[PDB]
Structures are given as C-alpha cells and as structure tokens.
From a paper:
NDM-1 has been reported to be a highly potent carbapenem-hydrolyzing, zinc-dependent MBL. NDM-1 is an extended spectrum zinc dependent β-lactamase capable of hydrolyzing nearly all classes of β-lactams, impairing the ability to treat life-threatening infections with intravenously and orally available carbapenems.. NDM-1 resembles the common β-lactamase fold, although it shows low sequence similarity to β-lactamases deposited in PDB (20–33% sequence identity). Our results show that NDM-1 is unique among other MBLs due to its enlarged and flexible active site, and explain the observed extended spectrum β-lactamase activity.
The structure of mZnNDM-1 Δ36NY was obtained in the presence of 10 mM zinc chloride. The structure contains one zinc atom bound in the active site to the metal site 1 (Zn1) (see below). Indeed, zinc was found bound to the Zn1 site in the crystal structure of NDM-1 obtained in the presence of zinc chloride. All four monomers in the asymmetric unit contain zinc atoms bound to the Zn1 site (His120, His122 and His189), therefore confirming NDM-1 as a member of subclass B1 of MBLs and showing that Zn1 is a higher affinity site, as predicted for other MBLs. This zinc atom is shifted approximately 0.8 Å as compared with the di-zinc NDM-1 structure and shows somewhat longer Zn-His distances. The metal bound structure is very similar to apo structures (for example, rmsd between Cα atoms of apoNDM-1 Δ38 comparing 218 residues of chain B of mZnNDM-1 Δ36NY is 0.46 Å). In the mZnNDM-1 Δ36NY structures, there are several water molecules near the zinc atom. Monomer C contains tightly coordinated water (H-bond distance 2.8 Å) that may correspond to the position of the catalytic water molecule involved in β-lactam hydrolysis. It seems that there are three distinct states of the NDM-1: metal free, singly metalated and doubly metalated. All these states could be targeted for structure-based inhibitor design.
Residue numbers in the entry: 40 to 270
Write the structure that this text describes.
C-alpha cells in the first residue's frame, strides 16, 4: 500500500501480518545487482530471523530496520546453508548478542567456506525433521532437512500459522531456465530433495526463495522436474 520499503541498502517486503522478506544486493560487474532474500518473523514479543544479508554491514542494517520498524528484540537467527548469501552476516549477529543456529553440517563446512559457524548446531532425525532439543523455543519456525540438493547442508523452513515456506537456495522459480550453480550440488538426489521439501510443507501456498520473488508451489514442481534431467 506504501510499497516495498527501502531501508539503507536493503529492501523489505511484507509477506504476511507477521512476516517480512528481507533483501540485500551484491552488484557483480556483468551480472547487475544480485538479490539475496531471507525472512523476518514477528512471533509475539520476539523477532526470528532466517538468514543474513550478503555482508555483515547489510546484516547490521537488517537489525536496525527491525529495531526501528518492529521495535521487538531478536531472539534468534537460523542460517539455511553455508555460503555468503545465507551466512555472510554471522559476525554482525554475534556482535548483537543474537543466538545463531545452523545445520551441524553447515557448521562443519563453515571453516572451509571461509565463514563463521553459528553458535548452535541443529541435528535432524531420519525423517528430516529437526530434533526439537537442538532447536529450543523456535515458536512458529519449523525446520526441515530435505537431504542433499543445491548443497549437501541445505535446510528449509516453514512458518507455522502462515501459508509461507522458505526453500533457500534449493528451490528455483517456476520459470527458471536452470538450477544454476551445481558445484556443491548432489545431482542424483536433487530432485527427491525438492519433492521432500514440498511434502514437508504440504500446505504452504507461498514459497519464498533466495534469489527471486515469492512464487507458488509451481516453483517446487518446476525445480524437481529440472532436477530429474540430471539423474
Ligand atoms: Zn548457496
């Protein structure tokens, strides 16, 4: 109604009464500006964050936006995989005293990827759901590890009480021409891993993704079908 708010170098798009997409950009000569998306979730008297911005500085701006726009404390942040777009503002989260969580494997891979591990490790049961003891007080955040896909550590998040689920860098948009960068990809499991995500949040009608605008469930089926062509 007032459109998408520009704050610092960042853009915020309200997806639901309690949920916002946060967006930061990296201008890569020859590619133009590349968007990275994450979530902000107001749960009662606290805010929960999914992913960082590309950099620590942009991640500090997310925190400033929350303080100024929502004025509630940030209880915790979850990072979807170990890569710059999801994990790049870890130091800013630490400096702010925010409890950080990532897949235990993300935390294992972090040093190699040249990044800072989150404070806490999430572990997942055989059915892919996070062990509740490793994710204390996650509220509406439901964390699912679909298996190896775009990376081996990629996880995914639904928001209880909304129609939203977030597939991270695993799901591409319904018109995407390719699955993009496969260097860390497990190409034989990728398709199953996408369908697993779909089945893990069967009710979500809005799929937020890393690099593009929110899409419908078509994004999941499109991604799965492209990934079928690799196996
Ligand atoms: Zn990635």
């Amino acid at each position: 109604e007032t459109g998408d708010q520009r704050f610092g170098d960042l853009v915020f798009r309200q997806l639901a009464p309690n949920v916002w997409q946060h967006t930061s950009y990296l201008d890569m000569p020859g590619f133009g500006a590349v968007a990275s998306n994450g979530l902000i979730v107001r749960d009662g008297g606290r805010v929960l964050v999914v992913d960082t911005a590309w950099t620590d500085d942009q991640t500090a701006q997310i925190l400033n936006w929350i303080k100024q726009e929502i004025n509630l404390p940030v209880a915790l942040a979850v990072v979807t995989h170990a890569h710059q777009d999801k994990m790049g503002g870890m130091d800013a989260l630490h400096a702010a005293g925010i409890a950080t969580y990532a897949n235990a494997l993300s935390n294992q891979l972090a040093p190699q990827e040249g990044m800072v591990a989150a404070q806490h490790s999430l572990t997942f049961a055989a059915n892919g759901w996070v062990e509740p003891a490793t994710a204390p007080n996650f509220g509406p955040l439901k964390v699912f590890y679909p298996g190896p896909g775009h990376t081996s550590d990629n996880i995914t998040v639904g928001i209880d009480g909304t129609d939203i689920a977030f597939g991270g860098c695993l799901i591409k948009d319904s018109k995407a021409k390719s699955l993009g960068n496969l260097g860390d990809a497990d190409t034989e499991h990728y398709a199953a891993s996408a369908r697993a995500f779909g089945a893990a949040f069967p009710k979500a009608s809005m799929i937020v993704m890393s690099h593009s605008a929110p899409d419908s469930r078509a994004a999941i089926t499109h991604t799965a079908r492209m990934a079928d062509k690799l196996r």
